[PDB]
Symmetry: none
Subunit: 388 residues, 4 copies
């Protein structure tokens, strides 16, 4: 029995909203439903062809909630189809894609919808504290709740900065360039193809169509970033300016076996070449994408020079610098349309979001090979190589 | 204001530790147990009940009426209105006050009042916006607002020059008082034992308060580190805890009690509330008590027993000293430092404890007082 | 002896629509404006205020007290106790009830009560209530057409009232900042839809159920606004030389059976009338809050209310429903209209949770 | 390319402890670690051969918690090895094995540790249950009386008692040491000996007034772990390790809203279809018994022979540590297939109220 090739035939993302911003009233289920219906519609896919739905989401109102199933139902997918919600923190959205591909290669499914969604704006009001944050004193601080685990992650980033010797200036420079790259991409409408617009109510009797990312900060300067106060550690280097934000958004892809796509007459946007995940030593927590990527590259028989475009999620500039330096990624190939520092980081979605952004840019540049990588827990990373 | 209001029944569950004996017994269950026992003890007909007013702070959301859930669970008719009071620390005593004024108004003849809280379960079912407050150390959530109140306590300690040693001495007295009370089964009359159930199968029976630290010595407190300020004076040993429990009282007009052949445990003589200046946050019980005493036509020397809730030794010292309360009249069976502080229940709990002790001692007058928010206090005078 | 309770001052801000005129005017600011104006209208000295009780639903902070912040902002001494009432839709009327209770008990002589809400500024914001309405519609057999025509009539009355500046006496204007250095005064409600028609209502899609009858057109919206009243004992009002606007005759609250959820105003009103020794026919004007036409039909029909006596200047379906404030808002509206019509007896009633209702009878 | 066959070469479980019972002080991590070390030790597996660890758990899945990874670290597995905690409610433990199998078939991994662990004693039980009502609705919908449910529960107890009397679980259990005296726990705690139909009929309904579901015809709240080691057939041959069983097929499926809780029915039909088998070809079935009402529906609709079903007792008797049960029933199936020397087995349970998962294995 032969192993199947998995292709991506459709891929879309909502704009990314700021915390308490445009999507404050548009739930994670709504955002996911919009992206799923659009993914399906763009390729005219019959709902009866969908075998499974696997969707990343981190912040749920309790045990027993299946956000993926709610979305699939809202999208009109038959109740007989199984849906699974993936909570793997930072990497949920890319892990969902990986799980979908495995299920195709195993012969279990021919057509799988995969992605991620998150609404972090709504979480403080509907998510129980035990699922919304972690306790401090995990190191006074103890007895305090760390919203979204942001403080624990920032300390991890500070520790990376210390061990790898990344200064405040170096981190701010990367952050500035992320913003520069997003601003130029948005000026050139680079995201037009991948974005599904989202309608919101801004006032009674008035609907606005949101088709632009909210989080990028226009006209940022190095001087401005230099003025910001440390966010997590006194005399630290990590600030709100060189870290990503708290954000809302969704991203969805449709996967098929090459054979199924052919049968349906649907042309692939990309092919999945390899993927891998890996753990790290506790001395370098947060550096997961490095061994994962080396492992995925080795599986594909490729080196980093063979990769035309890289998307490495930018939760923190400190961590982004480590990934870039240890993998020897050329500045010109990395997060070319901006990274999460500019674009935002809706946690359950980002892994899928960066894959969407990657595929559309590979297509625009007519390049052959790309890579998406990010954390999947503080101690682990996941990486996926795709080809056109 | 012609109707005289009496308390005819008063009961409380044991108070459980955080994640302790009641981690599987919700605020609704605890409150239902207390309500059913309070009714049962005086043989009250369920049709006599006109209203239910119950304190509770930590809720899964808006639109939740914990009081009504308890009333329904207790078999009280659906036509009876029920209200949940969320006024923080003071909710259980404010509920009694509201019940009393609804009787004096002529609106009601019989009202069930009290409070219930399960803080152990709260992290798992209460959204973060309702579970805690933001710090500023910013973007960090202060669970149960304990850090904010701890800092308020430190500021009182600074303002009034209450040393670490003075706070620990009060805390020690509280612990030792609770221990001796428990050794003498002092709370037996007021406690309703709680059967822990899983799918209506009994796993255990709780009839003793879990939180007191038996055999406490002064050195046991002096060895602890500050909890809120580096080089501060407030510790986990001289502040109360996070706790689970319920307490319920039944109020009636005197005429109604007489008609029903039910002897009062106590009469409510006065109550009052008051705000404080921002420089002395957390000191609410002081002006509230002075106000309530003036309404009763009494002075502090006319009061035989006082229950002033002990959230922080620092704050308790201020209340004791500013009101000039004889230490031997204050929290005589132990205070919240030893017994625990289930926030929605405590105001009603201390009133229950006060009433039974007045009766055992056969004295005439008592008062109960505590905060109703950082900026406010509430106080109630009762007589036997 | 029991104190008789009077209302000596009553004011409401305009009602703003969602994301409308008051999007940058918080529940506290709206509340403070209404409170300051209620005080100045009768020239009341700040030292006479004994307590402040204010309804509010959406400021759910642990340890947050909007009523006290409002009191502080209005220059009321910090020694005065203030309480925020969260009782959902009944909050603003419950506040007045608690105020009255504390005066009759002898605790207080002068109490400020009301409600305030800014639903625009809610970080996260009707589903279950909507289903409850859909269930009432089923049980009492109220059709889409029946609900839409009630909505239409509510709009008509509001249009008529506003055309005749009916709300001029009761409204306190609110200054808002449009840009740096430039403020604009809002003195008119924003939510009424002018010229809405039957055919326009009939085309709307059901809001909750797939084949349901409740829509955005026959239910209220979400809104921003505040309303404040000053209550005194009659004796106190005399000593200060302030004439009552109204006298509180009775009030009551009641629960309902699970089958009839959302019908709380019905037994609550019957109870209050019974305490007043009155019948529905003795009441000249009735304000029953209109969150849903389906439930408004139930209240109207079961209480056998003459439609010419009910919500005569429009109900919430037309005027808006700032939840923590509505209970107080309708009482304010009821009082001023009683004065204009020179009638003697009025009644306000609304839900206080899905399972309960509250009702109050006033006289002039 | 070529698709690899997945075999199970090691399989173990802890005893299942009662709520507040023997494992009151033994965490999901501790139970899980014990099960992993023993599974590894039993086949003399070099730690450097392990490619991935996938472990079910429900109650310890808070932000930034990774129970599987802590377990791997405690078991001495290199830190470079990725570990994943699966939270899929009741199906977590079987879903983990399924995910392990797919990662081997994909060529991603050669050796994967999979299973589940749960300590429900150390978690809060909050009621002021959703499963219990689903069960009542199944009872109503399918017309299962109180008496029918209790009859099933009693048979489950009787089968468990028979198996324990014959030391049936001896091969599959790893003993757990608990506390200054140290007692080795080597027997399941939860079965109720001397169980009678009458004693069952005396219990009160647990979820609904005049309900049929009780604490006696529903499974308990329990503590335990179960772990398995999966390899490609090629990798097993290379290491010289003989398989206990081979994974033939698996599948999952959603249900219609009217029949919530019946997931195992369409999931099993789907898995049998993929295997090229009918129910009558299956020699032994383990279908998890969360509620008698639900087990009755599964058994009837799939037309399962009672003499082949949960032959050593089901969860009503043995206990239901939720994140572990999916793995636990597979371990129990595999050992009993080997004792009876039969060829084909099926394990199935819910994975959410709306879904089920099933796996067919052969010997």
């Amino acid at each position: 029995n032969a192993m199947k090739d998995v292709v991506i035939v459709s891929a879309v993302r909502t704009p990314i909203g700021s915390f308490g911003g445009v999507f404050k009233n548009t739930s994670a289920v709504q955002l996911g439903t919009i992206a799923v219906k659009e993914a399906i519609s763009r390729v005219g896919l019959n709902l009866s062809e969908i075998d499974e739905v696997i969707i990343g989401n981190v912040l749920q109102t309790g045990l027993g909630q299946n956000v993926a199933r709610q979305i699939a139902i809202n999208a009109g997918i038959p109740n007989s189809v199984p849906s699974y919600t993936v909570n793997k923190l930072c990497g949920s959205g890319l892990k969902s894609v990986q799980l979908a591909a495995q299920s195709i290669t195993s012969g279990e499914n021919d057509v799988v919808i995969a992605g991620g969604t998150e609404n972090m704006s709504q979480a403080p009001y509907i998510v129980p504290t035990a699922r919304f944050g972690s306790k401090m004193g995990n190191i006074l601080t103890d007895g305090l709740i760390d919203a979204f685990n942001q403080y624990h992650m920032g300390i991890t980033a500070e520790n990376i900065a210390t061990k790898f010797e990344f200064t405040r200036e170096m981190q701010d420079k990367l952050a500035l360039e992320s913003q520069n790259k997003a601003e130029n991409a948005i000026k050139n409408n680079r995201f037009k193809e991948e974005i599904v617009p989202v309608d919101v109510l801004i006032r009674r009797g008035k609907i606005e169509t949101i088709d632009k990312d909210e989080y990028p900060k226009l006209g940022m300067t190095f001087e401005g970033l230099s003025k910001l106060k440390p966010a997590f550690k006194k005399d630290g280097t990590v600030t709100a300016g060189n870290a990503s934000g708290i954000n809302d958004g969704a991203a969805m892809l449709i996967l098929m076996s090459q054979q199924k796509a052919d049968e349906l007459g649907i042309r692939p946007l990309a092919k999945i070449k390899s993927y891998a995940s890996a753990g790290v030593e506790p001395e370098v927590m947060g550096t997961g994408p490095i061994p994962a990527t080396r492992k995925a590259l080795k599986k594909a028989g490729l080196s980093i020079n063979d990769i035309d475009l890289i998307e490495a999620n930018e939760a923190f500039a400190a961590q982004a610098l480590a990934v870039k330096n240890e993998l020897q990624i050329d500045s010109s190939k990395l997060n070319v349309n901006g990274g999460a520092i500019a674009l935002g980081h809706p946690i359950g979605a980002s892994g899928a979001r960066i894959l969407v952004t990657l595929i559309y840019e590979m297509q625009k540049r007519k390049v052959e090979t790309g890579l998406a990588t990010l954390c999947i827990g503080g101690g682990q990373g996941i990486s996926m190589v795709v080809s056109r």
